[PDB]
Design a protein around this ligand. Structure first.
Ligand code: HEM
Ligand code: CPZ
Length: 465
């Protein structure tokens, strides 16, 4: 057959006038009700194919894995990155970067303490800071941003920043601000009309400016690593990349020099800090709205781990309720609802249609996470979505918050380690309270574009002992 069906576009405006005024995702879900699971939407001058539903997404990403392996652009950050970094790269640059990441992290920890060990160390510092708050009300956003940023800082730069460090907090604010700009109304409009909006002042310039500033801190630190590189004591990931680059420096293959160390490092921070902290933020808000849930998670911690020894990843298999709660936080929060855009690399048959080479594809991960067949009453938060009658963890093919296939989240393991360890380490040591009654807690994101951002809230952590 040929092109997927969809709304009739105007020449310059595409389908703007058929859009839902509240955003891209709401817009696409409305087209899905009319056109089904595979459809075309013109974003400005650009046709993009949407795949929705568990079956259609798996079919593309696993069954047609290589054709769907291309990375599409995200208009708001592409001017900065320009296809550097594992996230944004394509073809050989991408394959080679991603394989090196994978092999590097398999070797990580034989030489130096493991990623789990670094996450436990950070969780330790967190709970001492929460203790130090002495039950004061706080917006936990900055702390949650700090802990996830510190895990990447520890892997990449071999150091941690203190929670009160002003230069650290300044940098974190620049990221946070960058992510809310990307997902703002303007950021979604840039997604459609970057071709002419780029000529004007606006949030896209502020984003470029923020990224330039961040990449300057990174570059300076990378330069200090080169200047002080000691081959017999490599300190961190940056030292590992440097030493490799020096050894492979002579020959231009799997060439480092079609790479950019600074941009790759920045993209690690970009992917690594925000979704995890936003997941944490959403998860504690959810625990405030459904307090019996946090209470049941504590009972399992008390039973399997106790009050004295630190949570460990080995504990996960013995804590089905807590795993179900974290899966439900991710499923409900739906933090990258349209995932990250793909492109089909060659003309591709798909469910009777033919998708042209180089067409952008959005896989609407949200529609898998909310599929009613898999999740009875999918718009409500309920950990029983991931539990069988016997209370064991019930895994499902619908649960794809990290996506699938060739491009599946590179930090899936790390992200899962952080969520489990931060969640359980905080809850081992503290109960939580807020001044706002559950009925007055609204869980509606304050922004929903590329990323979902939870509303602001206050919380206090009360020591158990
Ligand atoms: C709970 C937190 C996280 C969620 C929900 C998440 C989800 C995702 C999703 C949906 C994608 C797009 C996959 C695709 O293109 O189909 C992605 C990509 C990616 N993620 Fe994450 N992610 C999380 C945390 C992390 C962390 C902590 C890191 C860094 C260690 C990371 C690194 C990356 C990278 C490098 C990519 C690009 C992969 C590629 O293009 O080959 N992510 N993630
Ligand atoms: Cl624009 C954009 C792209 C990728 C991510 C991401 C990947 N993994 C975690 N976050 C976030 C935002």
């Amino acid at each position: 057959g040929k092109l997927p069906p969809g709304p009739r576009p105007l020449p310059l405006l595409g389908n703007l006038l058929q859009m839902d005024r509240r955003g891209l995702l709401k817009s696409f879900l409305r087209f899905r009700e009319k056109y089904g699971d595979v459809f075309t939407v013109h974003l400005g001058p650009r046709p993009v194919v949407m795949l929705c539903g568990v079956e259609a997404i798996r079919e593309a990403l696993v069954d047609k894995a290589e054709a769907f392996s291309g990375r599409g652009k995200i208009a708001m950050v592409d001017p900065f990155f320009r296809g550097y970094g594992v996230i944004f790269a394509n073809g050989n640059r991408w394959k080679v970067l991603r394989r090196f990441s994978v092999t590097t992290m398999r070797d990580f920890g034989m030489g130096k303490r493991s990623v789990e060990e670094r996450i436990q160390e950070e969780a330790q510092c967190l709970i001492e800071e929460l203790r130090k708050s002495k039950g004061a009300l706080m917006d936990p956003t900055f702390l949650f941003q700090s802990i996830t940023a510190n895990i990447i800082c520890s892997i990449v730069f071999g150091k941690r920043f203190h929670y009160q460090d002003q230069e650290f907090l300044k940098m974190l604010n620049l990221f946070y601000q960058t992510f809310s700009l990307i997902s703002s109304v303007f950021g979604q409009l840039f997604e459609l009309f970057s071709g002419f909006l780029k000529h004007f002042p606006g949030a896209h310039r502020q984003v470029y400016k923020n990224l330039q500033e961040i990449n300057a801190y990174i570059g300076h630190s990378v330069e200090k690593h080169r200047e002080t590189l000691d081959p017999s004591a490599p300190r961190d990931l940056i030292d590992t990349y440097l030493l490799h680059m020096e050894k492979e420096k002579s020959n231009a293959h799997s060439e480092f020099s079609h790479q950019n160390l600074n941009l790759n490092t920045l993209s690690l921070f970009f992917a690594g800090t925000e979704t995890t902290s936003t997941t944490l933020r959403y998860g504690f808000l959810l625990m405030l709205k459904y307090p019996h849930v946090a209470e049941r998670v504590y009972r399992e911690i008390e039973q399997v781990i106790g009050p004295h020894r630190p949570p460990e990843l080995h504990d996960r298999a013995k804590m089905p309720y807590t795993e179900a709660v974290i899966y439900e936080i991710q499923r409900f929060s739906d933090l990258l609802p349209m995932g990250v855009p793909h492109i089909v690399t060659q003309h591709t048959s798909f469910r009777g249609y033919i998708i042209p080479k180089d067409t952008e594809v959005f896989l609407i991960l949200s529609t898998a996470l909310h599929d009613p067949h898999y999740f009875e009453k999918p718009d409500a938060f309920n950990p029983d979505h991931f539990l069988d009658a016997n209370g064991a963890l019930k895994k499902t093919e619908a649960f794809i918050p990290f996506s699938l296939g060739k491009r599946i989240c590179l930090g899936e393991g790390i992200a899962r380690a952080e969520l489990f360890l931060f969640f359980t380490t905080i809850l081992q040591n503290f109960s939580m309270a807020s001044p706002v009654a559950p009925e007055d807690i609204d869980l509606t994101p304050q922004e929903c574009g590329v990323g979902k951002i939870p509303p602001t809230y206050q919380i206090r952590f009360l020591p158990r002992h």
